[PDB]
């Protein structure tokens, strides 16, 4: 009989909600009332990276804070030198319908994936001098949405099949599958400790996973629409999600429910990319209104705006040293901000 | 100058990459991109076979025009989370089977298959991304539709239909319904073809529709529109 399983699930959900309410004693707004306001944070387009002839959909900095990879529907992955506008490589993708790209922490490999249901690993440091296809990871039944490298041999991939995956590149096999989501998973961010990662799906739910264990620890539900972007706090004990309902929310793993709601009345367009700053005080969100809004994390106040894109800001990332912010968008242009 | 020797050669490599990117983009611009959409069986397999994983990219050349046909029927996910990737296609090839007026779905039998195709046509014709993207509507299963309408009535799918049960009027009624579902008549056109099994006439219709979209877009960039 399904009836008492449904009843037990309802009872468990009520108990979890009661525990969360008991944990929620003071809102983050109350604690951050006496802190110094961030002020007006104004950034200028320090460098515009031209060359793409399609919509940029994803990007990822290297660990050196200088190299930068970008994917667009021209079938081309371009690795840019951000300090001096320069493309070190131009990888011709097998499938032009790319929706995510990654840069390995070591810098040796670059990941790519999209509507081909394949995570393609590209080797940069080759003796031949050209970027080749190291491994073509297949097994997802849905389009790729976010690929992130644990190391040179492991990658975590989120697909639209409501499942996230972990892979072993040398064998090219599915070492672990992260199931539990209801809708299509749209984004994922590896924690700095690399043992945990959170993934956001279309079911308005953010989920926390253990890479080693393979089971969901905590599930977060505060949004009313699909989460398109997600990013860890630099501390690793918190993360932020951006959804199509034009609001960003900050969650904490220890408390396992929301801390702050980042929304403005004039903001109606959804969020396509969220990246924290190095210190975590500045939450950067790219919206569909052709703008990227800098948010203070501790106070839900708009520190600034990063306007300058003619179309929707699709990808947005922050350097590991915090010295730059890059906001590639659908107008085929990549802009570095400082 | 103030650029080192290897920095200069890196700039030279970047310039060569510029040249290759421009060449590839110029090659891509001259080649037409088409998105194939269908409901259920639809007839996508037949229409693809006539003109010779999540994306099935079928490429063919017809009259000095390279055609890219993208099939997205195997996605089986939320269409709204990836349909914006196809904003910019020249035309959408939409196929509805005219033999599905008297056929219901396996699940939710109260819903008809032609009604499912109409709901899909409303979804993608009035979609925010496909505002200026024309639709090359394909009406296949011609012989089966004629044979079925020889005995079955059109009223099963169209309770508000008043006409005979022959071919021409029923086909015209279906076509009129499908084009009348287009809310944004001032920015896009719906090209309708009753799928033929003779020669390359269907591919010719796609070629002429693509030629219209090309000329209309050229008028748009020229600002004459």
């Amino acid at each position, epitope marked *: 009989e399904l009836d008492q399983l449904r009843q037990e699930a309802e009872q468990l959900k009520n108990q979890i909600r009661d525990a969360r309410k008991a944990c929620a004693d003071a809102t983050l707004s109350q604690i951050t009332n006496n802190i110094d306001p961030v002020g007006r944070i104004q950034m200028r387009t320090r460098r515009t990276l031209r060359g793409h002839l399609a919509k940029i959909y994803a990007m990822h900095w290297g660990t050196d804070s200088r190299l930068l990879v970008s994917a667009s529907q021209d079938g081309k992955l371009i690795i840019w030198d951000s300090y001096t506008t320069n493309k*070190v490589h131009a990888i011709p993708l097998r499938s032009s319908w790319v929706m995510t790209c990654a840069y390995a922490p070591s810098g040796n490999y670059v990941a790519c994936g999209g509507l081909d249901n394949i995570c393609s690993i590209y080797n940069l440091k080759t003796r*031949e001098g050209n970027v080749r296809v190291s491994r073509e990871l297949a097994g997802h039944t849905g389009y790729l949405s976010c690929c992130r490298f644990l190391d040179d041999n492991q990658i975590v991939t989120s697909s639209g099949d409501t499942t996230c995956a972990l892979w072993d590149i040398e064998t090219g096999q599915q070492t672990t599958t992260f199931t539990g989501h209801t809708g299509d998973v749209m984004s994922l961010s590896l924690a700095p400790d690399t043992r945990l990662f959170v993934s956001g799906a279309c079911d308005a739910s953010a989920k926390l996973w253990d890479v080693r264990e393979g089971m969901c620890r905590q599930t977060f539900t505060g949004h009313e629409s699909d989460i398109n972007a997600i990013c860890f706090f630099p501390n690793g004990n918190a993360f932020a999600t951006g959804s199509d309902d034009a609001t960003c929310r900050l969650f904490d793993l220890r408390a396992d429910q929301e801390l702050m709601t980042y929304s403005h009345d004039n903001i109606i367009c959804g969020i396509t990319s969220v990246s924290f700053s190095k210190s975590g005080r500045l939450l950067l969100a790219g919206y569909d209104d052709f703008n990227c809004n800098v948010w203070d994390a501790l106070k839900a106040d708009r520190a600034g705006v990063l306007a300058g894109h003619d179309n929707r800001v699709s990808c947005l990332g922050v350097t590991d040293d915090g010295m730059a912010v890059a906001t590639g968008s659908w107008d085929s242009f990549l802009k570095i901000w400082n | 100058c103030t650029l080192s020797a290897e920095d200069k050669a890196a700039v030279e*490599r970047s310039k060569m990459i510029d040249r290759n990117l421009r060449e590839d983009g110029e090659k891509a611009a001259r080649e037409v991109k088409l998105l194939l959409l269908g409901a259920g069986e639809s007839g996508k397999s037949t229409i693809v076979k006539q003109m010779k994983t999540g994306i099935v990219e079928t490429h063919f050349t017809f009259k000095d025009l390279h055609f890219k046909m993208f099939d997205v029927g195997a996605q089986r996910s939320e269409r709204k989370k990836w349909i914006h990737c196809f904003e910019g296609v020249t035309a959408i090839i939409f196929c509805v089977a005219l033999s599905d007026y008297d056929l219901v779905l396996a699940e939710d039998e109260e819903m008809n298959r032609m009604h499912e195709s109409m709901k899909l046509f409303d979804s993608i014709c009035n979609n925010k991304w496909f505002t200026d993207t024309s639709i090359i509507l394909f009406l296949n299963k011609k012989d089966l539709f004629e044979e079925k309408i020889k005995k079955s009535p059109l009223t099963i799918c169209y309770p508000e239909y008043a006409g005979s049960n022959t071919y021409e009027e029923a086909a015209a009624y279906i076509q009129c319904q499908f084009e009348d579902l287009n809310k944004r008549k001032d920015t896009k056109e719906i090209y309708t073809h009753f799928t033929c099994s003779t020669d390359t006439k269907n591919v010719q219709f796609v070629f002429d529709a693509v030629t219209d979209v090309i000329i209309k877009n050229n008028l748009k960039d020229c600002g004459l529109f």
Partner: single-chain antibody, 232 residues
Framework: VQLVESGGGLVQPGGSRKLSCSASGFAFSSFGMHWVRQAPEKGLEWVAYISSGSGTIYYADTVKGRFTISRDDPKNTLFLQMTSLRSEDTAMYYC??????????????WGQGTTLTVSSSDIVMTQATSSVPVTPGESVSISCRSSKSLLHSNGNTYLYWFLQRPGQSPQLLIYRMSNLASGVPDRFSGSGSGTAFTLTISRLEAEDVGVYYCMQHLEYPLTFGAGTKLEL
């Protein structure tokens, strides 16, 4: 990867000869080519350079006008046309590949070389050590001094280290004074300040015996060193 070179041999003074460098195993079109001499008992001397796409061509002072360098990218071959040869050109010409981007490792591969025999303002780098007796397992600090500072405003110092085992083509060890080349063991490490540079071997092996060369890559009239030679 392989860079096999053809041509060479006896040539009468004032004659002409064509040196062909056959390339196989790597993307030749994207690699900038180089030519380096070595007299029968002297150091290395740079000759020419052709870039990717033949956009930029540089020769040496002793080479300009007489020699011309060209590449056939579809055929994956390199040419060094020679005119009005002289006795100073009696050297083994090496074919050198060099790709140029951020993080690249220029001068990765050196060809075996062809012996060409002719019958009868720039930076200067010195290695005063010359020969040195050595024992395995010890530490050696091969030093090289540049006339002018090799540190650029971009933070990249442009010193390179090369190893030439007896009867073998030169091999890249350290590029940009610090970066260990691919395949070189970790025993090699370089350091310097812009004027003086030292290359250190933590432990010596029997495979390390050879002649070490230091090269500059700041101004294109490339200058090598005399060559510190290690003897057991």
């Amino acid at each position: 990867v392989q860079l096999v070179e053809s041509g060479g041999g006896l040539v009468q003074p004032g004659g002409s000869r064509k040196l062909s460098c056959s390339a196989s195993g790597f993307a030749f079109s994207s690699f900038g080519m180089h030519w380096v001499r070595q007299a029968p008992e002297k150091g290395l001397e740079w000759v020419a350079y052709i870039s990717s796409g033949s956009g930029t061509i540089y020769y040496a002072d002793t080479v300009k006008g007489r020699f011309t360098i060209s590449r056939d990218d579809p055929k994956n071959t390199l040419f060094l046309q020679m005119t009005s040869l002289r006795s100073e050109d009696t050297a083994m010409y090496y074919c050198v590949r060099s790709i140029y981007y951020y993080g690249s490792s220029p001068f990765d591969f050196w060809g075996q070389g062809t012996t060409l025999t002719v019958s009868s303002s720039d930076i200067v780098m010195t290695q005063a050590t010359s020969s040195v007796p050595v024992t395995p397992g010890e530490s050696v600090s091969i030093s090289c001094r540049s006339s002018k500072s090799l540190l650029h405003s971009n933070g990249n110092t442009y010193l390179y280290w090369f190893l030439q085992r007896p009867g073998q083509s030169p091999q890249l060890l350290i590029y940009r004074m610090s970066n260990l080349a691919s395949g070189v063991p970790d025993r090699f490490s370089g350091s310097g300040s812009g004027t003086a540079f030292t290359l250190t071997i933590s432990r010596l092996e029997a495979e390390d015996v050879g002649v070490y060369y230091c090269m500059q890559h700041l101004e294109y009239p490339l200058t090598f060193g005399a060559g510190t030679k290690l003897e057991l």
